[PDB]
């Protein structure tokens, strides 16, 4: 079932679709903030206040952070992962930024067992490529300011290091210049939609993760548009790809599969390789509708399917290399024999070029070192991960 290929050609099908829209209810927003404040004055939540530097009204936002395991509890005031609340210049309480609900990998929670999924969800199933960077949230404030956030933060960090949020905003400025639109226009459009744009910042020249994003592929991969309400309502992916084209984002590849057993089959087939349609793929985020009643009312619901290998091995090599440099014992947990060889190769590379240690610590040279060892071994990552 690898007839299915991730596509960024869906924007055309969006012509027949219409964006979900729900306005905010200030009373429900106030009640949510009250419940979050109470929680914070003791399911533990942390509040951080940020000034919006660009705001002509001196707007401030409160970022709310939960522990990822607390999302498994019932009766949370919200399941948003990334949530920023504000008061307008008029004293109205609003959600400024709303992330996706926390979602889990297969067999991580009762809800994400294949039996549970098969029973309680309905398709069509959107399989969205899981791009490997940091999350960026974009929204428009009541006063017209474009807000750009990382998962829990906004603004530049006090030193000469660029924050993730500022780096995201600099990519956004470039993509807007390219298509001839402004931050003001984007802020007005997101406010009109009562929406948060959800993107993955992927740029090796800024920070390396595991998958490579060279200059031609670097920027903001738009993977979501959420409504700024306590509930979770997200755009269908073809409308996300249409918004991506209109506002100069990179598109997130999409596969729509009707039948849940075909979804399972496809994902298991890719799991063998950890690659799809020529490219390395770290995972998929599967988007569908779920009902509490297994046969009631339906709500937008996500789960992920991570591909364990070779990406687990690569992450181990990165952490082992940073330990080597820092003097802490490398934690070898898997791929023991090939990792022993990698660490001797790494030690040789660091001895030959002593600049590399400081670069590796700043998340530059990590992918190159991994690929240099694999070339040295005349192996593909997938082969290296299969040895053990
Ligand atoms: N198509 C997509 N749909 C949804 N999320 C996507 C995505 N592509 C990438 N992502 C990223 O996947 C993240 C969710 O993954 P999770 O498994 O919940 C935590 P993670 O990916 O291990 O990273 P984190 O703990 O550093 O946030 C989102 O925060 C977003 O940054
Ligand atoms: Cl309205
Ligand atoms: Cl992140
Ligand atoms: Cl308004």
Numbering used by the authors: 13 to 54, 61 to 313, 315 to 407
Pull verbatim passages from the article behind this deposition.
The structure was solved by SeMet-SAD phasing to 1.9 Å resolution. LIG-N is composed of three central antiparallel β-sheets surrounded by seven α-helices. The overall architecture of this domain resembles the bacteriophage T4 RNA ligase (T4Rnl1) structure consistent with it carrying the adenylyltransferase activity. LIG-C has an all-helical fold that is unrelated, based on structural comparison by Dali, to all other structures in the PDB from the same superfamily, which besides ATP-dependent RNA ligases also includes DNA ligases and mRNA capping enzymes. Thr146, Leu147, Glu149, Arg305 and Lys325 form contacts with the adenine base via hydrogen bonding, and His241 via π-stacking. Two conserved residues, Arg334 and Arg337, within an α-helix (α11) of the LIG-C subdomain coordinate a single well-ordered sulfate ion via salt bridges near the active site pocket.
The fungal tRNA ligase Trl1 (previously named Rlg1) is encoded by an essential gene and is involved in tRNA splicing and the unfolded protein response (UPR). Trl1 is a tripartite enzyme, consisting of an N-terminal adenylyltransferase domain (ligase; LIG), which belongs to the nucleotidyltransferase superfamily alongside DNA ligases and RNA capping enzymes, a C-terminal cyclic phosphodiesterase domain (CPD) and a central polynucleotide kinase (KIN) domain. Third, the LIG activity ‘seals’ the healed ends through ATP-dependent phosphodiester bond formation. This final reaction occurs in three nucleotidyl transfer steps: (1) Trl1-LIG reacts with ATP to form a covalent LIG-(lysyl-N)-AMP intermediate; (2) the bound AMP is transferred to the 5’ phosphate end to form a 5’-to-5’ RNA-adenylate; (3) Trl1-LIG catalyzes the attack by the 3’-OH on the RNA-adenylate to form a phosphodiester bond, releasing AMP.
